[PDB]
């Protein structure tokens, strides 16, 4: 019954084509509830979930003001980072930020995160104790020391254990008709002859939420991960996800294989076998 609230921020410089593109999205578990696109016409944090529309004008003006400030901060960051890495102003660069909190089944603080990346790699990240930082390279050291001096960790810890938790709790309550659901996957298996002596067994998982899930194939109870073609979990587009796992087996040996499905919405893991 674990839950989380997470914000994802992306800023991409476009040299010779204006300010950096800034995109921010907010999530509760696997459900997006807000968004901001520096390139959109509204220029305001927009709702993306029914239950968040409940928030009044103060909320939206507040979130808008803060998301825009995040935008400005990353714009500055991009230029600062080029200097740190002694890079020219000619290429495009990306700054990404991700932070949030997780609460347990009791909805009490479990853990907090706040990570930062440059051009797709770890730059700096708050340690799990929410008191110290992990900086990859030499260049990230400056940021680490600046943030330590300004008590950024303390500020973040207060937010992650407090503000983030209370609002996450509020959201779960306001969206109690959808946000708290754990939809187990609908499953089934297909069988297709590849030749006269081999057949494909595909194990399907559809309409599930949250996206987290485990689909494995076993032969005589042995894990067959290396022989499996497992696609990445995909969003159906309606708030549910999908996934499948396939294995090619010798015709006539199907009975020895079992597909196992693990998911938060399932009261018991499933064990399927072709019949």
């Amino acid at each position: 019954g674990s839950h989380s609230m997470r914000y994802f921020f992306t800023s991409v410089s476009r040299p010779g084509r204006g300010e950096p593109r800034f995109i921010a999205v907010g999530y509760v578990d696997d459900t997006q509830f807000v968004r901001f696109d520096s390139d959109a016409a509204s220029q305001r944090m927009e709702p993306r979930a029914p239950w968040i529309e409940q928030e009044g004008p103060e909320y939206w003006d507040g979130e808008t003001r803060k998301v825009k400030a995040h935008s400005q901060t990353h714009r500055v960051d991009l230029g600062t980072l080029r200097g740190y890495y002694n890079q020219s102003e000619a290429g495009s660069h990306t700054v990404q930020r991700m932070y949030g909190c997780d609460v347990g089944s009791d909805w009490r603080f479990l853990r907090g995160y706040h990570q930062y990346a440059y051009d797709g790699k770890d730059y700096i990240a708050l340690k799990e104790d929410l008191r110290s930082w992990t900086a990859a390279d030499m260049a990230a050291q400056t940021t680490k020391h600046k943030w330590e001096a300004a008590h950024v960790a303390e500020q973040l810890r207060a937010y992650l254990e407090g503000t983030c938790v209370e609002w996450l709790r509020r959201y779960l309550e306001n969206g109690k008709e959808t946000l708290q659901r754990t939809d187990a996957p609908k499953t089934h298996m297909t069988h297709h002859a590849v030749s006269d002596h081999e057949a494909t067994l595909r194990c399907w998982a559809l309409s599930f939420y949250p996206a987290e899930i485990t689909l494995t194939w076993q032969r005589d109870g042995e894990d067959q991960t290396q022989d499996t073609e497992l696609v990445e979990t995909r969003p159906a587009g309606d708030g549910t996800f999908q996934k499948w796992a396939a294995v090619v087996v010798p015709s006539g040996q199907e009975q020895r294989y079992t597909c196992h499905v693990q998911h938060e919405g399932l009261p018991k893991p499933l064990t399927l076998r072709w019949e």
Binding site: G26, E63, K66, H70, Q155, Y159, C164
Partner: peptide
Amino acid sequence: FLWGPRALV
């Protein structure tokens, strides 16, 4: 609900 304070890199 976004984190308010700004922290420059």
